[PDB]
Design a protein around this nucleic acid. Structure first.
Lengths: 38, 248, 136, 75
RNA sequence: AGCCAGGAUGUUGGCUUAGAAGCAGCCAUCAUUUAAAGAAAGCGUAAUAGCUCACUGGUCGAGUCGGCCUGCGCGGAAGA
RNA sequence: UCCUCCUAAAGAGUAACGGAGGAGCACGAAGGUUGGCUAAUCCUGGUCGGACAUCAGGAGGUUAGUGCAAUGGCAUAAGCC
RNA sequence: GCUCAACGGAUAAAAGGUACUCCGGGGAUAACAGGCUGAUACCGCCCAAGAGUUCAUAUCGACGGCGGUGUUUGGCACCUCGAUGUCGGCUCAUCACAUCCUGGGGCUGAAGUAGGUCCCAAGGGUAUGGCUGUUCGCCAUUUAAAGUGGUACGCGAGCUG
RNA sequence: AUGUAAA
RNA sequence: CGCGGGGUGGAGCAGCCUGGUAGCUCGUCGGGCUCAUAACCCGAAGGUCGUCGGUUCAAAUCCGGCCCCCGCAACCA
């Protein structure tokens, strides 16, 4: 998973979640777009 | 092909009978100059070593334009000369041989990037003598270039930068020398294959002046002209070789 | 790299970047890249910002560069002590005031210029904004 | 390469307007002619305008190109 | 915003005849039936086929979608 | 050692191995007075003559010149005869 | 009559070596170190052309930029010249994780093994010989690994030289 | 000073 | 860019210091001599002194500006 500092929506199925303060970008379509802290 | 439209180097060298073969190498320069001025080619003499009784022993000449190498591929080899030899005061027949090399352009894409991300720089303490600085400060730099395997060791001066500049200059010189040595070996391994020993053996071209015929092994050609041959007009001999070379 | 040709002097003083901007209004194109942050832009930054803005806005259109550095900045060789004369001229900076028009573009849609000026702001260190030429 | 710099010659306006000066007092030390000789003001070879009377100094902007003039009123 | 629907017949279209055919690149980016349909934004095929969105219906039934100015915060922020 | 611009913060002054440059002369005239005149750079025309000899006309204005490297000044000319 | 140009001119008249040195001193001033900063170095991030059968983002990444550390070279001399012994080696270790292995997981251009990259985690371990005084490096053979640094780039009132 | 090679 | 040496036939040198004249050698071309090659002899071309502004009756020269080539550029006891 990607561990970048700036997080944008890559595809159309990206969703901005705020799990435990950690801003995550989840994707139900492609597992490669799931990433970490932003 | 890309090489086809490319320019060429002609290297006409004297073989057997260096007195006579220089006179025939001058005639081959005359041959390909009259063949070159017919189709409007540029002829520049890069190097020409003169003989004794006239002519030239070695001629290296660039011909530029659009399509020199692709039209002159099949000229590397030997040339037998049966003629009343200018030299003979007596006048008997002889085989004067000459060797012709045809080299392509191979344009120089020199000086690749030094790639400091690929350079492993080890800055460690120095050996030798001189002061306290040898104990604590490093003053010794080793740089290894990974895809080539070249190690440069510098322990010359006190500061590292003044040794970093020397180490990069030695890296540039050693990489340029190792590339130009491979290029000169690639030139020589092809020139040894194209140019033979220089003897009169039959190597693809046969010449016959007192008979009026030249026979070419490289696709037998038995055309008795040598007067529309001695002043340009060599396309016909060259053309069926290309015709049965494009079949393969 | 943008570089002046045969100026009167080779080296000049550092100076400060005080004062407000003069190039505020857009004068040539229909849009513009107005810079908000007070900073200094080297000539490599302008050349790279031209490179990664020109390719996305393709062979049509027209782009104006409203700034020119014309200010020489030196750099001392390393492991050389302080003093001993001013250093050798290395690069060229433009002192950019708050609200200074850097690039302008005409012949493009608004969304294409919006997406190109974001990349031009990403290639530059100073903060910019997006402006549009109002008539008078 | 650089480093040479000269000693200053202490130019400028020594006697400003309003102040009464004696006869022969130096008013303005100038390099060229920024000020010109008017009433009761002499000019030297060093372009140094000096006093010729006992009065007050007055600056005027007469002339076609608005050149400066120093005058001295006998007060 | 979700939910069962639609999202067409020639378009195997002329193109470099091996195929690019709604979706490599060319340009044209028509027009009908019309509650609605871009001769197409994406996925997938050698090209098809197929799957969604554009948009339009219906159940539903109250406010919602996208930008500007800032205040305080979040992360980037890891040493012996 | 000395001179000129900045540094130098609008009187004077002001430091750094700061940034640009020069001088260790010359002049019997290039000095004094009197009298008279205004260049540089372009355009047109003309035998040699051609981008530039010189002259005539026009624009232009002190960008010319001031022995000398730079600053200030100069037509009432300090420029020229 | 002085380029007495060291030009307010010590004589009219004067170059060098000291590791054989010696004295009065100085941290007013250097070397080793500690201190401040981080041009340089190492590492992390922003943007994105492009490499990758398609496909920037599996892995890389030009042109550019922003930050962290005080581990290299640097800069200034703040402390030391009425004395702070430093390089390498032997023994003894301590601490941080920017993790070499073991452990738990995510992506993959991950069929399985063997992999590439990344997050958390310092509890434990983290070579043997030749050369060189050498740290380091190469070679030979193991290992699961042959980690990076700080501690006066550790440790001579513990030891050689 | 010299002037190779095919009776 | 900073410093030094310069820019003289196709090439290398005089000649610059100290001004009043373009010179020498090698080379190129052509012709004799030999049957020829080498050697020797003769003739021709070639540069305005890298270029430009000033002093001078006169700049290849003296001075300055520009262009080009080569070499030198921080060590270190």
């Amino acid at each position: 998973m990607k561990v970048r500092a700036s997080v944008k929506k890559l595809c159309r199925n990206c969703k901005i979640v705020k799990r435990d303060g950690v801003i995550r970008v989840i994707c139900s379509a492609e597992p490669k777009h799931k990433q970490r802290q932003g | 092909d890309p090489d086809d439209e490319r320019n060429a180097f002609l290297e006409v060298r004297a073989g057997t009978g260096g007195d006579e073969a220089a006179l025939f190498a001058g005639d081959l320069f005359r041959m390909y100059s009259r063949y070159a001025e017919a189709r409007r080619w540029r002829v520049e003499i890069m190097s020409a070593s003169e003989g004794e009784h006239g002519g030239y022993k070695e001629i290296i000449a660039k011909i530029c334009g659009d399509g020199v190498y692709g039209r002159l591929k099949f000229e590397s080899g030997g040339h037998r000369v049966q003629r009343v030899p200018a030299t003979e005061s007596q006048g008997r027949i002889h085989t004067s041989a000459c060797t012709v090399a045809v080299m392509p352009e191979l344009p120089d894409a020199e000086l690749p990037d030094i790639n400091p991300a690929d350079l492993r720089i080890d800055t460690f303490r120095s050996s030798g003598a001189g002061a306290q600085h040898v104990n604590t400060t490093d003053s010794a730099i080793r740089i290894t270039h990974l895809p080539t395997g070249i190690v440069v060791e510098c322990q010359d001066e006190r500061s590292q930068h003044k040794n970093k500049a020397k180490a990069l200059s030695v890296l540039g010189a050693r990489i340029h020398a190792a590339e130009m040595a491979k290029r000169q070996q690639a030139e020589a391994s092809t020139r040894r294959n194209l140019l033979g020993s220089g003897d009169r053996s039959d190597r693809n071209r046969t010449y016959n002046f007192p008979q009026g015929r030249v026979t070419d092994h490289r696709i037998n050609l038995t055309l008795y002209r040598l007067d529309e041959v001695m002043e340009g007009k060599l396309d016909m001999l060259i053309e069926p070789i290309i015709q049965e070379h494009q079949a393969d | 790299m943008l570089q002046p040709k045969r100026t009167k002097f080779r080296k000049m003083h550092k100076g400060r970047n005080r004062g407000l901007a003069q190039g505020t209004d857009v004068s040539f194109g229909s849009f513009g890249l107005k810079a908000v942050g007070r900073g200094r832009l080297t000539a490599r930054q302008i050349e790279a910002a031209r490179r990664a803005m020109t390719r996305a806005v393709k062979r049509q259109g027209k782009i104006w560069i409203r700034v020119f550095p014309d200010k020489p900045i030196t750099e001392k060789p390393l492991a050389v002590r302080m003093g001993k004369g001013k250093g050798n001229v290395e690069y060229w900076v433009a002192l950019i005031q708050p609200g200074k028009v850097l690039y302008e573009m005409d012949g493009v849609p608004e969304e294409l210029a919006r997406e190109a000026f974001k990349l031009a702001a990403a290639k530059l260190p100073i903060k910019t904004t997006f402006v549009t030429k109002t008539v008078m | 390469r650089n480093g040479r710099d000269s000693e200053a010659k202490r130019l400028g306006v020594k006697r400003f307007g309003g102040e009464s000066v004696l006869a022969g007092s130096i008013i303005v030390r100038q390099r060229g002619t920024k000020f010109h000789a008017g009433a009761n003001v002499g000019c030297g070879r060093d372009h140094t305008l000096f006093a010729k009377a006992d009065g007050k100094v007055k600056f005027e902007v007469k002339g076609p190109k608005n050149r400066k003039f120093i005058s001295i009123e006998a007060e």
